[PDB]
Structure 1
Amino acid sequence: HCLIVKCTADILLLDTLLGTLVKELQNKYTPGRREEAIAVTMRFLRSVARVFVILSVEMASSKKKNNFIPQPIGKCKRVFQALLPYAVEELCNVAESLIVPVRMGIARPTAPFTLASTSIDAMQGSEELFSVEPLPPRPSSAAQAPRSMQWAVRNTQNASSYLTSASSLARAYSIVIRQISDLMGLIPKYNHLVYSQIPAAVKLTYQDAVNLQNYVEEKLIPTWNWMVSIMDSTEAQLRYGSALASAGDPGHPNHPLHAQGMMSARGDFLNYALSLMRSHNDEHSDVLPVLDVCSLKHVAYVFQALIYWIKAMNQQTTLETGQNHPFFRRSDSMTFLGCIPPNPFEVPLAEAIPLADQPHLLQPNARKEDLFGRPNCLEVLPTKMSYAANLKNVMNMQNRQKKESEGPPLTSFRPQCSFMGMVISHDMLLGRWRLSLELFGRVFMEDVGAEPGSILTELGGFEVKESKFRREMEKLRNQQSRDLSLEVDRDRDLLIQQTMRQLNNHFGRRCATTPMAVHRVKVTFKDEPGEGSGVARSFYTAIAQAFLSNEKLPNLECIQNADDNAPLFYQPGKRGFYTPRPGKNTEARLNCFRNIGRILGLCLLQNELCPITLNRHVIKVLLGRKVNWHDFAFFDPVMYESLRQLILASQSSDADAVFSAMDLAFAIDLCKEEGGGQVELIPNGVNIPVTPQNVYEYVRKYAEHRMLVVAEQPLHAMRKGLLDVLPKNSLEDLTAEDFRLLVNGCGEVNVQMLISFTSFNDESGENAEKLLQFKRWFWSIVEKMSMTERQDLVYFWTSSPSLPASEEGFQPMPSITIRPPDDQHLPTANTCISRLYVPLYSSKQILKQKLLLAIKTKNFGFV
């Protein structure tokens, strides 16, 4: 301990010690000395290992990924790197000794403790533990789960505890498994990473790596079996409960979606014991299995660590007009874990993508399975619920698989994971335990997700990405002390020209190759020059409305001093949703589009919403990544399905006659909003007929042309515009769905969501019951508002119509102040603090009439 933790200004001492051990370990010419040295070395290494574990358990893992890795622990790694083949063996034994008290269910209860943040306060605890004399001889005298899984949780639909200590031992076990994997990771490079790094270290060879790997696998089999058997049993119980939820009647009070002391407790216990006894023989067909997952935190830690090991091994293993062409392949968000596509030419568009079928189906906390359509030891599913039968089957399956270096230098070492299954790749296991994983990916994210590179964060939905979004956008905002100020009219024509001109004067007088990072974005209206946030929200709204209008533009050439008057955007296909209209493709138009891209970057940088509802292929291009056949469903679902039907017809026995009868050629009509007329998909395309054999090219070119070629210059302009404000790295987290939640927020005003973010303040002096009745009245009116009237309400209350898609979306929070009783006055809202103030109206009718009249007086003054 003291040599490592307390020589806080030295390292040559430790190096000398290691050099001595290495020299004597190589003293082969002296009899017995070899074995003596090995015995000495091992006895030292176990002491090093204790010091290492104690330190590693105390120091809290930095949630920002940092190389703080304090020098005590760095020194430990140096020892293990220098003495590798021995270090591995002793580490197995420390790992084994740490897990058994939990794996047998024996361990002591303890109170909890905070992990230590500073190096100093981490180190001090170990001093008081190693500053000890032997006893003298006698003197000479947890984010909450979705409804499809809530029934499986003990939830509401210091003292010691056993579970504390069971969990912390699993936490500690994971560390050692990672470290063993890391050391196995160094082996191929070792003939370089010895001599280029450390004065002395043990020589080792391919033959030794084999035997180390043999040894390491064996020591993991018991904990592996224990993990696997419990996981299979859990996944089975979850999937069965879901199938029953589908087949059963939600009107019944015992349905999973619908749902005293001693006797209720004896009820709970008896329900559990009866469910246990039933489950063993599959006598459990028509009631939910009794289960809680919150106890299973220790298997969550162990599972996470055991994947770490296999994942590392896999990194050592890896080191047309066909329907198989990349255009037709499923894309980002669509390719499920270890899954194979429901083929879009065999499956209806309506069914292949329920989100592309129904665009308003997207929610922040919807399960990914909905939006893109629901998808040997691993091939057979977790069918049995019983624990015991799974364990027995696991062991039988394991029995099925049971039933200088010459040649390779270390750089050529070809390890893998091959036992328990013949090949494991982690995608398969993410396929097998899919629901257990997703549930852990909500419940345990704060804790098991804090492990370095914890596989739970890969199941991280919208909010995980948004947690990074605030940190990055606020970091980009706070690095600059220079504002953006825009003074504009409310008139559509003046608004567009003035906004774009001032953005060019701001952009061009700052370096045009550096992102427009700003401190604050401030907006003032002419004849209403109120300023800052709510005014700027009203502006983002109004400027978006100006671009989406079907009225003719003013001459955009006015923007160059800082006619192509076609409307800026149109709705392609049979969506309510927009793509840029190319107009006459003049530079003035592209200049305008490049400024519009800047507006997206600015709103996001400020965490402010921009109500511009762009199509998926447009957004993929803005993100700078590839567009596929599936995005043509987001261009035009009716045309995508008609071309799917055309492909189904190419698979019909009369395809040559049907394609002759349709009279199709490689030329397409464009609407006026796409530039008009008839355009050839390939040169001479009017004279080239579509046949059942060339149709795959025709459908490809049709889709590619309509999504990209028609708008390539507007798209090039807007993307440049976004990069003019924000750095490229910020795009890398996102698919179009995520970008939608951040840019547009929740367009659907979910009243329960708005309730949860709303606070009520009272200035009226009236009693809590009248206040609660008035609060009920208000929400019952907002519930009865049409979605438009709700959007107008939030626009009145905040100067933006969409709800932010989270608590993190609000800056500041929405609030309602109840003022003293008045039936004459209207409700009024300071949108620059997003706060509404309402009189205590004498009746629900007056509250409704006054509220609706206020939000429908759309001429809002910029308070």
Structure 2
Amino acid sequence: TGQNHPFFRRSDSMTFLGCIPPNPFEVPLAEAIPLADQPHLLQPNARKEDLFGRPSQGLYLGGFEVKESKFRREMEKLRNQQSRDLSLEVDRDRDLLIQQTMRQLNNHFGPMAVHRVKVTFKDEPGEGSGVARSFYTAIAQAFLSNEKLPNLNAPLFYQPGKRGFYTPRPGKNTEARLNCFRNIGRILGLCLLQNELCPITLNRHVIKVLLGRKVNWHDFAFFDPVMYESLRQLILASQSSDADAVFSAMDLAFAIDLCKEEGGGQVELIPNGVNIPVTPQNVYEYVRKYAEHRMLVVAEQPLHAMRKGLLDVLPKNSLEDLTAEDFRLLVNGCGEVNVQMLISFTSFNDESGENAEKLLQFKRWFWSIVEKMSMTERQDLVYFWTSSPSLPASEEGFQPMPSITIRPPDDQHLPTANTCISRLYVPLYSSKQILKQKLLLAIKTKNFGF
């Protein structure tokens, strides 16, 4: 049609019923989608109105907890329906872990009827329940870094412009990289099916390809914000009072050059020549073809392999009526660690046998030390406790419902972690600096044992 082609329209996942959506060109990024410029507002107790802005009035069924609870009973029904297991022997490094994971994940899943996966690294007497979480965060950080690929060699992800969000690169894709893209959605599928957390983070166009929903123009704001703004003022300048005194001197075309993560350069969008100039009356065709080529054309086979790998685990009926945001909440959790929620997930088991005001003064020191701690050390402490670098967003995320306990007082004993399910053991000391030094010395170790 014109400017109102079905690419520039808000989908069902970002609108409210009976309200006219705003115009997608006259409003900046902060006042339209406040989740684009900063992504830390995704919380379990977060309203949808403060995530996608205020809708316009028409005269001028549930939320998170309904979806995730029904999804959790459907996953445990599917889990108890099957009774075939999977054992894993991994190596705590990057290259050996990646190679061993993709050679031991081909024997399985090649629908599927797995039940439970057990994890052991090597020479470690720590076979419990946190080994699966440790394996999931190990494969996530193995595929999350950018060094190389240890044969079967470009990296499998890049960062489109926001830190922490990862989008795949083809990199002259071949018969091995496509299989490595196929066997990475299965890890996310098992994380969804076993009710855990895996630290792999994707942009919403990657997820919306996997779920089976069409990608629109507003999903480009979560991809590249500065290019979104540049094309926004290009469209607004294309409908000025004159619009020909600035497009005759800009000298654009329908040809594209690409960066190192996409390939070469000088690719024609529409055929039969790159010599056409962009007159103002087909600027929307240029914007749509540019965005659609940047998402859905160069990354066609990695996204296709990821969707095939995701549907190789689960049947194609459970992901219906599931948005990308609660998809992120069931997998990535809350992201950063908030200490108030961590206070709300404790019990204070007492076994010290001391009457220093019947305890209840050592805990103020502990919480002051925890609240006066750095963010990386906070993730280190949470990984020290539950073998996971972030906390879930609900009571139902934890199977053992974690706890700390106080031991008989020894001044020389640094704190220990019974992390095979959830528990932390803390000896009692005197004063503050002793506890500070012992705990900040203890929480830098991630090696299991016992």
User: TM-score under structure 1 normalisation?
Assistant: 0.50
Q: Cα offset for 1:678?
A: 3.9
- The offset of 1:783, in angstroms, is 2.0
Q: Within 1, Cα distance between the matches of 2:393 and 2:14?
A: 22
Residue 527 of structure 1: CA displacement? 3.0
The 1:859–1:406 alpha-carbon spacing in structure 2 relative to 1, beyond 3 Å, is: closer
Distance 1:722-1:687 versus aligned 2 partners, 3 A rule = same
Q: Does 1:552 align with 2:232?
A: no
- C-alpha contact (below 8 Å) 1:573/1:639 kept by paired residues: no
Whether the 8 Å contact between 2:269 and 2:289 is mirrored in structure 1 is yes
Equivalent positions of 1:556-705 (< 5 A) are 556=152, 565-684=153-272, 686-705=274-293
Greater shift after overlay, 841-850 or 489-498? 841-850
Deviations 1:25-70 (A, max 9, x none): xxxxxxxxxxxxxxxxxxxxxxxxxxxxxxxxxxxxxxxxxxxxxx
Note closer, same or farther for the CA distance 1:526–1:330 as it changes in structure 2 (3 Å cut).
same
Distance in 1 of aligned mates of 2:243 and 2:433: 64
SS in 2 for 1:829: strand
- Give the Å deviation of 1:583: 1.9
Contact residue 655 and residue 692 of structure 1 kept, 8 A? yes
Structure 1: tracts of 5 or more residues without a match: 1-320, 375-404, 408-458, 509-514, 557-564
CA shift, 1:745, in A, is 1.1
3-state SS of 1:520 partner: strand
Following superposition, the deviation at residue 532 of structure 1 comes to 4.6
How far off its partner does 1:675 sit?
A: 3.1
Worse overlay, 777-786 or 710-719? 777-786
2: CA distance, partners of 1:537 / 1:622: 23
Conserved? CA contact 1:601–1:726, under 8 Å: yes
Q: How many residues align?
A: 447
Aligned to 1:755: 343
Go from structure 1 to structure 2 and tell me whether the alpha carbon gap of 1:687 and 1:839 turns closer, same or farther (over 3 Å shift).
Answer: farther
Are residues 341 and 857 of structure 1, via their aligned partners in 2, closer, same or farther at CA, if it must alter by over 3 Å?
Answer: same
3-state DSSP of counterpart to 1:838:
strand
C-alpha separation in 1, matches of 2:190 and 2:237 = 48
Map 1:406-445 to 2 at 5 A.
none
In structure 2, relative to structure 1, the CA distance for the partners of 1:586 and 1:767 (3 Å cut) is farther
Cα drift, residue 861 of structure 1: 4.5
RMSD: 3.9
Shift of the 736–546 alpha-carbon distance from structure 1 to 2, 3 Å rule, reads same
Say whether the 8 Å CA contact 1:521–1:602 is kept in structure 2: no
1:792–1:855 Cα contact (<8 Å) kept: yes
| Residues 667/778 of structure 1: CA separation in 2 closer, same or farther (3 Å cut) | farther
Q: Return the alpha-carbon distance in structure 1 between the equivalents of residues 227 and 57 of structure 2.
A: 64
Q: 1:851 to 1:665 in 2, by over 3 A?
A: farther
Post-superposition Cα deviations, 1:356-413, rounded to whole Å, max 9, x if no partner, equal 1211121111110000002xxxxxxxxxxxxxxxxxxxxxxxxxxxxxx999xxxxxx
Q: Distance in 2 between matches of 1:847 and 1:678?
A: 62
Query: Partners in 2 of 1:680 and 1:784 — Cα distance?
Result: 55
Is 2:407 the counterpart of 1:727?
no
Query: Do the aligned residues in 1 keep the contact of 2:168 with 2:299 (CA within 8 Å)?
Result: yes
Q: Secondary structure at the match of 1:544?
A: helix
The question of whether the paired residues in 1 share the 8 Å contact of 2:109 and 2:313 is answered with no
Q: CA deviation at 1:858?
A: 3.8
Instruction: Please say if residues 548 and 569 of structure 1, whose CA atoms lie closer than 8 Å, have aligned partners that are also in contact.
Output: yes
Shift, 1:324, TM fit:
2.1
Structure 2 distance, partners of 1:694, 1:848, is 65
Given that residues 20 and 57 in structure 2 are in contact (C-alpha distance below 8 angstroms), is that contact kept between their aligned partners in structure 1? no
Per-residue Cα deviation, 1:227-256 (whole angstroms, up to 9, x for no partner): xxxxxxxxxxxxxxxxxxxxxxxxxxxxxx
1:768, distance to aligned residue in structure 2 (A): 7.3
What is the CA-CA distance between 1:690 and the residue it aligns to?
A: 2.4
CA contact (8 A) 1:521 1:533 kept: no
Cα deviation, 1:806-845, whole Å, max 9, x if unaligned, reads: 1111122121122222343332223321222222232333
CA-CA distance at 1:669 after TM superposition: 2.8
Greater helix fraction, Structure 1 or Structure 2: 1
Question: Counterparts of 1:471 and 1:785 in 2: how far apart (Å)?
Answer: 37
Post-superposition shift, 1:788? Answer: 2.3
Distance 1:825 1:813 in 2: 25
The sequence identity of aligned pairs, in percent, is 100
The answer to whether the 8 A contact 2:19-2:57 is kept is: no
Q: 1:339 to 1:767 in 2, by over 3 A?
A: farther
Counterpart Cα distance in 2 of 1:659 and 1:842: 74
* Distance 1:607-1:769 versus aligned 2 partners, 3 A rule: farther
CA separation of 1:501 and 1:529: change in aligned 2, threshold 3 A: farther
Q: Give, in angstroms, the shift of residue 343 of structure 1.
A: 1.2
Tell whether the 8 Å contact from 2:185 to 2:309 is kept in structure 1 after alignment: yes
Structure 2 spans left out of the alignment, 5+ residues: none
1:51-62 equivalence runs, <5 A = none
- Distance across 1 between alignment mates of 2:312 and 2:334: 26
Q: CA deviation at 1:661?
A: 3.0
Higher relative contact order (CA 8 A, sep 6+): 2
Whole-angstrom distance in 1 between the partners of 2:293 and 2:284 = 14
Deviation at 1:758, TM superposition (A): 1.9
- Deviation at 1:468? 0.7
Q: 1:860 to 1:471 in 2, by over 3 A?
A: same
Q: 2:205–2:219: 8 Å Cα contact kept in structure 1? A: yes
Q: Is 2:181–2:302's contact at 8 Å kept on the other side of the alignment?
A: yes
Residues 87, 118 of structure 2: 8 Å contact kept: yes
Q: Secondary structure at the match of 2:108?
A: helix
Distance 1:807 1:647, change over 3 A: same
Is contact 1:575-1:636 (8 Å) kept?
Answer: no
Deviation at 1:488, TM superposition (A): 1.0
C-alpha separation in 1, matches of 2:429 and 2:279: 70
Alpha-carbon deviation of 1:330?
A: 0.8
User: Matched residues in 2 for 1:861 and 1:701: separation?
Assistant: 55
